[PDB]
Amino acid sequence: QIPPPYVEP
């Protein structure tokens, strides 16, 4: 189960 990274710093 992988949580999406960040796009906005």
Add this chain to the structure above:
Amino acid sequence: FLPKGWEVRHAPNGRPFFIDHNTKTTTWEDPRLK
């Protein structure tokens, strides 16, 4: 209330995934609960 660069965002599934914006890491668990 979070560590620096940490996010509490709710995905469209209705789940908050905590992002670490520093080391590009992502986790469903909360450093605040510890």
